[PDB]
Design an enzyme around this catalytic site. Structure first.
Site, mmCIF file in Angstrom:
data_model
loop_
_atom_site.group_PDB
_atom_site.id
_atom_site.type_symbol
_atom_site.label_atom_id
_atom_site.label_comp_id
_atom_site.label_asym_id
_atom_site.label_seq_id
_atom_site.Cartn_x
_atom_site.Cartn_y
_atom_site.Cartn_z
ATOM 1 N N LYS A 1 -16.191 58.045 -18.403
ATOM 2 C CA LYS A 1 -16.926 57.015 -17.584
ATOM 3 C C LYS A 1 -16.858 57.014 -16.476
ATOM 4 O O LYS A 1 -15.907 57.184 -15.502
ATOM 5 C CB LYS A 1 -16.650 55.072 -18.961
ATOM 6 C CG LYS A 1 -14.889 55.198 -18.275
ATOM 7 C CD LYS A 1 -15.153 53.764 -18.744
ATOM 8 C CE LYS A 1 -13.275 53.663 -17.739
ATOM 9 N NZ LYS A 1 -12.775 52.025 -18.500
ATOM 10 N N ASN B 1 -13.625 55.894 -13.676
ATOM 11 C CA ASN B 1 -12.836 56.222 -13.717
ATOM 12 C C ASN B 1 -12.889 57.967 -13.295
ATOM 13 O O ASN B 1 -12.385 59.331 -13.221
ATOM 14 C CB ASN B 1 -12.527 57.418 -15.512
ATOM 15 C CG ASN B 1 -11.810 56.679 -16.433
ATOM 16 O OD1 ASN B 1 -11.153 55.034 -15.389
ATOM 17 N ND2 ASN B 1 -11.299 55.971 -17.031
ATOM 18 N N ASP C 1 -11.679 58.184 -22.242
ATOM 19 C CA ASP C 1 -12.174 57.869 -21.569
ATOM 20 C C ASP C 1 -13.064 58.190 -20.597
ATOM 21 O O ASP C 1 -12.779 57.394 -19.522
ATOM 22 C CB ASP C 1 -10.304 57.090 -20.943
ATOM 23 C CG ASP C 1 -10.802 55.402 -20.940
ATOM 24 O OD1 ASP C 1 -11.668 55.056 -21.149
ATOM 25 O OD2 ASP C 1 -10.067 54.844 -19.034
ATOM 26 N N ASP D 1 -6.768 58.520 -14.576
ATOM 27 C CA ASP D 1 -6.578 58.019 -15.317
ATOM 28 C C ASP D 1 -6.604 58.553 -16.637
ATOM 29 O O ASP D 1 -7.923 58.842 -17.527
ATOM 30 C CB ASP D 1 -7.433 55.936 -15.709
ATOM 31 C CG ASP D 1 -7.310 55.335 -17.264
ATOM 32 O OD1 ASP D 1 -6.108 55.334 -17.109
ATOM 33 O OD2 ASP D 1 -7.575 54.037 -16.512
ATOM 34 N N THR E 1 -13.833 53.093 -24.209
ATOM 35 C CA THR E 1 -14.107 51.536 -23.622
ATOM 36 C C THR E 1 -15.918 51.814 -24.742
ATOM 37 O O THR E 1 -16.847 52.600 -24.833
ATOM 38 C CB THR E 1 -15.151 51.648 -22.904
ATOM 39 O OG1 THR E 1 -13.655 52.158 -21.895
ATOM 40 C CG2 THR E 1 -15.904 51.286 -22.334
HETATM 41 CL CL1 LIG Z 1 -6.653 58.454 -5.993
HETATM 42 C C1 LIG Z 1 -6.898 56.743 -7.210
HETATM 43 C C2 LIG Z 1 -7.861 55.862 -6.001
HETATM 44 C C3 LIG Z 1 -8.163 55.019 -7.198
HETATM 45 C C4 LIG Z 1 -7.367 54.590 -8.281
HETATM 46 C C5 LIG Z 1 -8.580 53.149 -8.975
HETATM 47 N N1 LIG Z 1 -8.731 52.885 -8.192
HETATM 48 N N2 LIG Z 1 -9.275 51.754 -9.928
HETATM 49 C C6 LIG Z 1 -8.655 52.076 -10.756
HETATM 50 C C7 LIG Z 1 -8.680 51.589 -12.105
HETATM 51 C C8 LIG Z 1 -9.933 50.379 -11.798
HETATM 52 C C9 LIG Z 1 -10.793 50.813 -11.970
HETATM 53 N N3 LIG Z 1 -10.965 52.115 -12.618
HETATM 54 C C10 LIG Z 1 -9.362 52.347 -12.616
HETATM 55 O O1 LIG Z 1 -8.234 52.923 -10.369
HETATM 56 C C11 LIG Z 1 -7.269 55.586 -8.910
HETATM 57 C C12 LIG Z 1 -6.794 56.722 -8.145
#
Ligand SMILES: Clc1ccc(-c2nnc([C@H]3CCNC3)o2)cc1
Ligand SMILES: Clc1ccc(-c2nnc([C@H]3CCNC3)o2)cc1
Ligand SMILES: Clc1ccc(-c2nnc([C@H]3CCNC3)o2)cc1
EC number: 2.7.11.11
Length: 341
Positions: free
Chosen positions: A159, A162, A157, A175, A192
């Site tokens: 991108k 992430n 994944d 992620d 994606t």
């Molecule tokens: Cl430490 C940490 C802080 C924030 C996030 C996070 N915020 N949004 C996401 C998703 C949706 C869009 N991209 C992946 O992950 C994950 C881990």
């Protein structure tokens, strides 16, 4: 070929991963140990929320997955992959999982909170990264894949959304929802569209070479401001991907174009990262001639920029989403499907 210090480092990394992989931790906190602060992002089957631990005061990012929506979207194996991998890995450029648990309705993965936001936001704000800036981030991904692939893991994944930017300006990958431990080949259609390698699109059995293809897409996007293959319909994107044709902006250096043609190689048997010399073909390429690989790993290089934020609980680098309940049903759901979580 490789220095014994590098071989010994990776051998110990695998030993430590396998000990946790074979005996995973479970049920290490519960929901009412935290206060909810803000939704940081949403998704198909889940969301991520900033939380604060009520006893310690530490901030965390809590990823919440609805068990029923996971079953309906056929993501059971993938969610189990994510938690089992995250509780076993340890590397400077990977987000750290601190707690995990489940209840009647949801699965929870509680990670250290990285306040600098997603690389995607910063790239879109500035337009494009200079080659030194792109190369600083790319070197961190190269090392991360060297580590992950040595554990027989594929990430699947990569991108900009992430890759989080931390308080030192370094990357932490988040992620692991598509990550998987793979001995030879694997077959799932996932990712994606803009980042998919040709062999995924063509329904072949594929391997870690798909991560090196995605690194080519990421480096192109960082240095250009847009990805190499795009269109309104996924089928149109796929047609461009399989065609073997890529156009480069005139401002790209010759070294950058040469590296990208070797990462964006449609024939997986000819793609950099997947040849006899593996990762070394990438690390030794002219575009990386200025990179001090050990210094990057040790976090001793000054970063191109540090995100602006006021403290460990600041959410200014993330955006605004409708705030919805975290409801937990009175009855247990899908208990048998998630026994291992
Ligand atoms: Cl430490 C940490 C802080 C924030 C996030 C996070 N915020 N949004 C996401 C998703 C949706 C869009 N991209 C992946 O992950 C994950 C881990
Ligand atoms: Cl992916 C990756 C592969 C190898 C190494 C490594 N090999 N030797 C070291 C030493 C020097 C700094 N502290 C341990 O690190 C690090 C990351
Ligand atoms: Cl459809 C399906 C396909 C593959 C697997 C699988 N592969 N490895 C496992 C491990 C972890 C859970 N139980 C043994 O399960 C499960 C279901």
């Amino acid at each position: 070929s490789e220095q014994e210090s590098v071989k010994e480092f990776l051998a110990k990394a695998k030993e430590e991963f396998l000990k946790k992989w074979e005996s995973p931790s479970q049920n290490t906190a519960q929901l009412d140990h935290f206060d909810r602060i803000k939704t940081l992002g949403t998704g198909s089957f889940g969301r991520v929320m900033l939380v604060k631990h009520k006893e310690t005061g530490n901030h965390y990012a809590m990823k919440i997955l609805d068990k029923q929506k996971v079953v309906k979207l056929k993501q059971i194996e993938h969610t189990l992959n994510e938690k089992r991998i995250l509780q076993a890995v340890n590397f400077p450029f990977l987000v750290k999982l601190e707690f995990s648990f489940k209840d009647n309705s949801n699965l929870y993965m509680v990670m250290e909170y990285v306040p600098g936001g997603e690389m995607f936001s910063h790239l879109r704000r500035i337009g494009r990264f200079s080659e030194p800036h792109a190369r600083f981030y790319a070197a961190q991904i190269v090392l991360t894949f060297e580590y992950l692939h040595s554990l027989d893991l594929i990430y699947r994944d990569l991108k900009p959304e992430n890759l989080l930017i931390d308080q030192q300006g370094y990357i932490q990958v988040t992620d692991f929802g598509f990550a998987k431990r793979v001995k030879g080949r694997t077959w799932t259609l996932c990712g994606t569209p803009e980042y998919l390698a040709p062999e995924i699109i063509l329904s072949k059995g594929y391997n870690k070479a798909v991560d090196w293809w995605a690194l080519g897409v990421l480096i192109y996007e960082m240095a250009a401001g847009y990805p190499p293959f795009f269109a309104d319909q996924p089928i149109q994107i796929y047609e461009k991907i399989v065609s073997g044709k890529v156009r480069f902006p005139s401002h790209f250096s010759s070294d950058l174009k040469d590296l990208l043609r070797n990462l964006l190689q449609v024939d997986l048997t000819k793609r950099f990262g997947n040849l006899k010399n593996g990762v070394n073909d990438i690390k030794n390429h002219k575009w990386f001639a200025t990179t001090d690989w050990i210094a990057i790993y040790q976090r001793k290089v000054e970063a191109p920029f540090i995100p602006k934020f006021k403290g460990p609980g600041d959410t200014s680098n993330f955006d605004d989403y409708e705030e919805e309940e975290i409801r937990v049903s009175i009855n247990e759901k899908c208990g048998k499907e998630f026994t291992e979580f």
